[PDB]
Design a protein around this ligand. Structure first.
Ligand SMILES: [Fe+2]
Ligand SMILES: [Fe+2]
Ligand SMILES: [Fe+2]
Ligand SMILES: [Fe+2]
Lengths: 249, 259, 259, 249
């Protein structure tokens, strides 16, 4: 199927039109969705007002096995992160529905961590390839794992930075050097060029490849009500450039 | 007059609908647009597909005295940007009285990428803890035209806005250094204050369509042109309006120091 | 009494000669040593090869009330450091009333490396431009005992010294964060102020010989033990003297917040 | 000859006793000096009060060809640098005599740039190996050259960071990334452990391997008089890990 896919930004994000999301889509719509997702890192479906907790949950299961910690968020995820990277097999994907949408503010921003890696000069990609980092849940908006800083993506084979606010430190370097190296690689992920911002409407859905993005939820809506609900899908164990695996410690 | 005003982001930015920009809008509509501008820092008008080089110029004049910098043919003041401003700045802060405002029109608009992001330098200011507001009040910076996408001047880091009375951070990528401080100290003080300006909360991103027009209060924003569109054509045209001499928290004024 | 005092570095540090440290020095010699200490921030006595665990302890008591922290046998208060403090700090700033002073003796001294460097936190303060003195006055930091080489407390960043009246930076590697600021802002404000403390100009390095003794005013220094000697034995023994509760620029006092 | 060599710090610097410096030392004393210099990166000779402008200059020539820009310094070199790295063939060595020595202050500090490199974790040495930097004389205390950040030392073969305040930027990286990477590699050079500080007496001489050190002159002596005089020796063209050479641009 060629679905109706309109890219949102130069280097990540696509709206998909003419698809009402259900627990009843057929393998072709589902696979096309899954390739749009790998290609564009985050995908959006508007006017999905027919959807409700249970359709979301049953629509989710069509794309892998759901995992706990359906989550409700209402306090606010404004730091750049990849969902649950303090566990070994952190989600492969998240599906997020807008239940209550603020009139101004309330946006969400995604960063493509594959392209982030691609744009690093070669010597700085070689070094990213050899680094590992400690993820902890000292930080949660809603455990200590070691992940390689470069995740070879189990399906595209695309390499992506595996970083974000869950990172406690880079293994094997002083405080000062871990901050400097994390600032470099991290500031490549959040470079504006590598991101896409979604202004939400009630009933909008977004689905992202957590193996290959970070995201941040803008806290600018003061006390306007904002409720979003999230389903995540279990993910594989991260494999680094040299084949080594993540290990929870 | 209450224009039909839809805020884009929590802290900056408003679309204005039902207004057809021309050299012939009445004083009232202009005043209301001036109020939206000061309040929202950047305002957007979609579907101005009737505008052209000359009407953009004539429309500009209704909001102040346009000024140049090499301009588009047929025009007195129009600067074309194409073949990129991907760097947080405030326009021409390397001169003493930098534009108070720029009016930008989309001529050619990439199918994907091509966006622009504005930051609310007055909100950046309000959010800093008192002691660091106090320090920002007391600093000065040298701006230069080394780093231009399209001269040295000394500006306070905090500009008292000549109409709102709101204080704003005055920084961006025209800054060579903070006057009075080592290089390491300059970079760390700059990095703190700048990082409030660009904090996502303080920004608004616009996706352009041919005929979109944006107007921003350059006294109280920085902006950034996102360079993600490859070789897709992107043509925008800009008119700037002459601005006043910035006045610091304690009345001091900027001074050009190389020309 | 004018002791025989030779300054080591331009801005901190003095060797004192012709004095044999004992539990039996007269009030005069002690007062003169107290004056050298406050003036020079760290003072050095070579060739105290007669000192031992007990005489070090007895000598300490002549300068204030010694305090502990697991101590050396035979002693009430003596801490042994060996098998390393290579990190700029001020002693035990994770407690509310941290030592005002430590007295350190070299027991075993590497043939090469093994040095120690002190920084004059009061000079670090004097050298900052007025506006950044003003900001440093207004800040507070949390110190913790996460990072120890040998509890959370809140200290002003500027301590008014209880005898000299000199203000000093109160920072070092016991600081977890600046209270009231993001992580990025804390690290940048910390990095600015710290970088004045350790600026080479403000420091003095000592090469140890067995029997060297150093005494520093812990209210107005940081120090650092240089880790360059490999597996060469290094044994030093330290006695700390109880200190007052730090008082900030505007009279506020530190408060322990976890124990 | 085993000369009388007493190391000053754990990882750089040695005083040499029982040697009066002259234009008349014999090849054995001179070679032993040259090996002490390569081994310990900086070497010091006390009580050389017999020395004067011309003996210095004639003692110098016994260790390579002198090069201009005998220099007099009196304003002050307090930034970490390697002498003349804005030229292609910057000095291999400097010889510095203390003419007037302040009573307190006035010290000098050297950093061993070889050991600095040695202590970097492997992946961060691999990346240093591939970097180049632009040296300029926008900064002089007393031209734009590209040097590799890692100089393979023409005699020891020891690799050393080639950095310092003459560096305008790292070639091939944004402003922000060049500052972050330079801070990392640079803060390894100036780590206290890698340095040695000399308190000068009138007539003290110091000679350093500029291929393998940086140094900084402490400005803490206010208006006390301080005069030192320096002779430098021409050096080879820097060769990087991969054999490429520096090029003045
Ligand atoms: Fe999340
Ligand atoms: Fe601009
Ligand atoms: Fe200590
Ligand atoms: Fe030099």
């Amino acid at each position: 199927l060629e679905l109706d896919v309109h890219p949102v930004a130069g280097r990540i994000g696509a709206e998909i039109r003419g698809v009402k999301l259900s627990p009843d889509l057929d393998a072709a719509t589902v696979e096309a969705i899954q390739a749009a997702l790998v290609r564009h890192k985050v995908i959006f479906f508007r006017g999905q007002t027919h959807l409700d907790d249970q359709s979301q949950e049953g629509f989710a299961k069509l794309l892998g096995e759901p995992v706990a910690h359906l989550l409700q968020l209402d306090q606010r995820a404004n730091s750049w992160h990849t969902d649950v990277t303090f566990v070994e097999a952190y989600p492969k994907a998240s599906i997020l529905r807008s239940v209550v949408a603020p009139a101004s503010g309330g946006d969400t921003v995604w960063a493509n961590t594959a392209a982030a890696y691609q744009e690093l000069p070669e010597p700085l990609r070689e070094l990213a390839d050899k680094l590992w980092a400690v993820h902890s849940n000292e930080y949660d908006y809603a455990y200590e794992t070691e992940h390689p800083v470069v995740r070879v993506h189990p399906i595209s084979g695309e390499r992506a930075l595996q970083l974000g606010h869950f990172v406690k430190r880079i293994k094997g370097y002083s405080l000062a050097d871990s901050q400097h190296l994390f600032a470099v690689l991290q500031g490549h992920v959040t470079r504006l060029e590598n991101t896409v911002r979604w202004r939400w409407e009630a009933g909008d859905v977004a689905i992202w490849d957590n193996r290959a993005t970070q995201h941040y939820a803008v806290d600018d809506y003061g006390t306007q009500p904002r409720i979003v609900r999230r389903v995540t899908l279990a993910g594989e164990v991260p494999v680094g450039v040299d084949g080594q695996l993540s290990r929870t410690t």
